[PDB]
Amino acid sequence: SRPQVTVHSLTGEATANALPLPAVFSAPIRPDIVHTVFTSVNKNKRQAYAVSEKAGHQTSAESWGTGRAVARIPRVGGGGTGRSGQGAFGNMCRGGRMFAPTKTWRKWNVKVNHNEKRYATASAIAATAVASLVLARGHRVEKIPEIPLVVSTDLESIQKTKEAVAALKAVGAHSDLLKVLKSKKLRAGKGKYRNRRWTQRRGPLVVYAEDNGIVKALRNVPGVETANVASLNLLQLAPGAHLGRFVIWTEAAFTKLDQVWGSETVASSKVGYTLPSHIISTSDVTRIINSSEIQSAIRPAGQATQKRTHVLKKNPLKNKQVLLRLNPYAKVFAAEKLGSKKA
């Protein structure tokens, strides 16, 4: 057993009821897998494109030949047209065939391991309960009264959008929606004319367990994606393969979340699946090292940065002072003169 999460109601006050932690939230937060899983999964909702099979070969051009004092590129026949006697066929040639034309049967979709895929989302979900992780991902969550923010199930019932944004204002995401909204920008590409004209920031994900008009309530309010706890996307959770979307859960969703994934106590629901195990015990190292344990079986430390010995080469012969550190006798060699010795 862990701590236990408080649930707030749609005025923003703490109700005496509090839910246990599901312990999907104790999955490994593997940013490595989230990346290598996201990437593939992001390429899956893609269309083909190719260039026209005919185009480039829709010319009737002939290679002029050897010893004609012009380059041997296939040149169009005809006369009086100005397209006569000129380069078609060849990647260099204007109106020629583009080098190795894009075909439709490029691999566009990407096959993932179903386990890997799942691991990902667990990590994703975990990181969505960390706050700091969420603050670094974006998401103005300085005013949300706790993470993970779990909300009373009467959130689903709200019909009119107007009221259901006031569910969020009271909860505190007032800021996160104004992060979006204010962020509306023109796309900076040719995407201005491939129907990608706009782009704004990704708001809160809302997670309901069963709909009573939440999906429609929020479908307008910009950036606010909702998801049924039974699905739960990677792409909504790790947007752009950055861990930790800010997530509101509903009381009902949160409770079911245990069934969906499974713990030590409960089963699984996904068939023969188990949440993955840590290859460490504590995701912190500096508790192992600044221990009572390890620091008891250890040779002592340095200064972190050595006091350099011998920086510059003082030479004896000249400099008397060094010629006394090497060989103390030379004081005695000089009081007796010794170089100047009579026989």
Partner: protein, 46 residues
């Protein structure tokens, strides 16, 4: 009332002094061990 040292930080002072009083005893017995060393070298050079 009044505030105490943390128990890790309290242990530090205990195992700094187990080294600091150890080291200054090692150093001061080396200052004499090199004074004696010097005198062996001087008498050898002569």
């Amino acid at each position: 009332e009044k505030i105490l040292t943390p128990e890790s930080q309290l242990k530090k002072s205990k195992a700094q002094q187990k080294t600091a009083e150890q080291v200054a005893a090692e150093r001061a017995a080396r200052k004499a061990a090199n004074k004696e060393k010097r005198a062996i070298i001087l008498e050898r050079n002569a």
